[PDB]
């Protein structure tokens, strides 16, 4: 899926940095391997439909008293891994205290950056403890003109890919010469790298084949 190059499931590993003047979308495009859905997803396509490609620049988050290696059975690369540019921040072990952390990132380029994170709405209230500490979690973001607050939603669901818990991926846009801030202690799917739009192109849809000599 067009948004799959931003999270990078085990299928978009060559379009992490894809350079292009043209985009094609298919009936089997899936932005997700661990079930979920973006929030304001179609908006991102139209911008991405005309982005000319993305330059992955590393964001640089250092995880201390936890894991980063977070993995599940759906988003398999080789065995069981996760999205490429996303550290599934489990607790320290398999229930442990996920302490209160806070990270920030800054833009050093004349172009704006694409910032994507996600909440892990766990399938139960225990599976919210299985990967993070117990007690309520609030992941609130900050910017000079963006101020939000999410609460993970622990609740039963349909099983998609054998998993019932979900991951709702959000995004905002960081202007050149500014920052972003995350304060959290749970249910967080961290970003490793943030996209940078390359220029001008076009995305369409079709369900047919291509031709290059015309």
């Amino acid at each position, epitope marked *: 899926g067009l948004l799959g190059t931003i999270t990078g499931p085990p299928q978009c590993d060559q379009f992490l940095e894809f350079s292009a003047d043209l985009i094609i979308e298919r009936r089997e495009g899936s932005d997700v391997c661990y079930p979920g859905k973006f929030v304001n997803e179609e908006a991102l396509r139209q911008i991405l439909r005309e982005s000319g490609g993305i330059d992955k620049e590393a964001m640089g988050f250092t995880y201390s008293g936890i894991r980063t290696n977070g993995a599940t059975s759906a988003c398999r690369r080789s065995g069981s891994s996760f999205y490429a540019e996303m550290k599934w921040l489990l607790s*320290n072990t398999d229930n442990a205290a996920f302490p209160q952390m806070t990270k920030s990132y800054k833009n050093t380029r004349k172009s704006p950056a694409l910032i994507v994170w996600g909440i892990h709405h766990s399938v139960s209230t225990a599976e919210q403890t299985k990967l993070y500490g117990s*007690g309520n979690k609030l992941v609130t973001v900050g910017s000079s003109n963006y101020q939000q607050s999410f609460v993970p939603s622990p609740g039963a669901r349909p099983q998609v890919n054998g998993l019932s818990g979900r991951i709702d991926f959000h995004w905002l846009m960081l202007n050149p010469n500014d920052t972003v801030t995350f304060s959290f202690n749970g249910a967080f799917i961290a970003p490793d790298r943030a996209s940078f739009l390359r220029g001008k192109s076009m995305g369409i849809q079709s369900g047919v084949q291509v031709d290059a000599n015309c």
Partner: antibody
Amino acid sequence: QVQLVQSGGGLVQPGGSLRLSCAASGFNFSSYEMNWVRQAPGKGLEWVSYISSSGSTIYYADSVKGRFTISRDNAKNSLYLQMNSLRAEDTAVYYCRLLWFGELFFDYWGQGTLVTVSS
Amino acid sequence: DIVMTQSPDSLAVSLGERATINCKSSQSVLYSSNNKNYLAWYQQKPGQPPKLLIYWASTRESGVPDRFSGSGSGTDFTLTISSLQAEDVAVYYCQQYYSTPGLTFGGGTKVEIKR
């Protein structure tokens, strides 16, 4: 009833090696976190290593950094501890395990083994 | 890692004496958003493995009679055997299960009854 038992203890000589072993009874093995704790002769307790549910993660201590090797089995009900380059501070008797989890309870330790690194 | 201590090292307090064991910590063990203390009490007799005594700091484990009680919060606690008994001649430890792959116990303490 849940119960545990350790084995593989005796007399060894330092710079040598041993391979400890646990056995279980009365619970879904494959689903929990498993620890390891040793106690030197009349000393305090010490955490050695653990394995997560899927065995996908292991974390040791610094006294055994590169000297010990914890290992699991879920079909068989066994948790292992290979030892290598034994030293004399490694003289101890070994136990362990908890209940992880949040909520409710638990407990639970084994009966033990005499392991001395006296050549 | 979180380094732990107790006092007194050894107390010889007589039968029926409210024995008071004080125990400290370097780093805090009280999680924020659920407000719970990661502290346990155990009872080992030489050759025996530890037996569970108090958890959540202030929650007794079943099978433990009423004289046992855990108190305190944050970095300092205290076990008060309201009526010290002769069954209670054992070694008691504090333990943290805050950080994870390093559970630090203590220095201990024996409680031998006077006369």
